[PDB]
Ligand binder design. Structure first.
Ligand SMILES: [Zn+2]
Lengths: 48, 262
């Protein structure tokens, strides 16, 4: 198997908050991202 | 190999009403009847069983040997109830917005079924064909079998003459088959919902959304299928009452004509 993808997901508001924190900082800025990572299985069918 | 096919209009109606049920996917079913010799080998199709397709997708139409077991059980039941020698003799599917002819995959599947018995025949219904240039509607049907090519594998199609036998009135078997379509649609939606609930650890608002989707789907099913079908059956009952009155009048007229004449 080992058929693995690694999609990333966000919400509009979190990107807005990062953008806001940045626009207030007159320099580079940085921080940490907290969330959860979950694997989903799709048993694709090919012809028959 | 089969040389002709007679289809009872009684069952052609079930097939046609199944084909016009949906345009978004292709639908399928099996045909029960008998083999006969007269004047030539002929297949008389009396009734059909509607089937639910799980894999769906375009052009991928197959029937599981599980469905064959269920169909053969129903065939034995109908053979004992009706005293007819009924075996599963054919299959049919729909080609909506698609030419009535079989695809190479349809023909390969027909050949895979002929491997069971070379006496097996296939049907295809081409439904709503749209053409604003002619501004006319069209609906077709055809029957076919398959033959091994001169070259390796690559099976080829062959045409079978098919006629519709005028079955002046409705058999109860066809009503009992037609009322199975709403049941199968409802069961399909219910199985989708049950498989959705398997991951119990899921958001509550999401479960409300999925419940709303299930309700909307069954509302559509009742608005588009069960409702019109029930309206059709009521209209048919009214038509039959009027026709009974007219035929009673005609019977009395002919009785008088033969009593007074000679
Ligand atoms: Zn097909």
């Amino acid at each position: 198997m080992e058929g693995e993808s690694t999609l990333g997901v966000l919400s509009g508001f979190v990107l807005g908050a990062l953008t806001f924190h940045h626009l207030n900082t007159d320099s580079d800025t940085e921080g940490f991202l907290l969330g959860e990572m979950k694997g989903e299985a799709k048993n694709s069918i090919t012809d028959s | 190999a089969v040389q002709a096919v007679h289809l009872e209009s009684d069952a052609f109606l079930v097939c046609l009403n199944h084909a016009l049920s949906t345009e978004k996917e292709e639908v399928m079913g099996l045909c029960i009847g008998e083999l006969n010799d007269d004047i030539i080998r002929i297949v008389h199709i009396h009734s059909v069983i509607i089937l639910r397709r799980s894999d769906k997708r375009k052009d991928r139409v197959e029937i599981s040997p599980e469905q064959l077991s269920a169909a053969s059980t129903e065939a034995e039941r109908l053979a004992e109830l009706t005293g007819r020698p009924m075996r599963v003799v054919g299959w049919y599917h729909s080609h909506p917005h698609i030419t009535v002819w079989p695809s190479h995959v349809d023909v390969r599947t027909q050949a895979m079924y002929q491997m069971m018995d070379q006496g097996f025949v296939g049907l295809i219904f081409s439904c709503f064909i749209e053409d604003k240039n002619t501004k006319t509607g069209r609906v077709l049907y055809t029957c076919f079998q398959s033959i091994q090519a001169q070259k390796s594998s690559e099976y080829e199609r062959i045409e079978i003459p098919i006629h519709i036998v005028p079955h002046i009135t409705i058999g109860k078997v066809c009503l009992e088959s037609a009322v199975e379509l709403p049941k199968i649609l409802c069961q399909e939606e219910q199985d989708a919902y049950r498989r959705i609930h398997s991951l119990t650890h899921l958001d509550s608002v999401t479960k409300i959304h999925n419940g709303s989707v299930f309700t909307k789907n069954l509302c559509s099913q009742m608005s588009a299928v069960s409702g019109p079908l029930l309206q059709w059956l009521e209209d048919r009952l009214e038509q039959n009452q009027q026709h009974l009155q007219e035929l009673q009048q005609e019977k009395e007229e002919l009785m008088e004509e033969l009593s007074s004449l000679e």
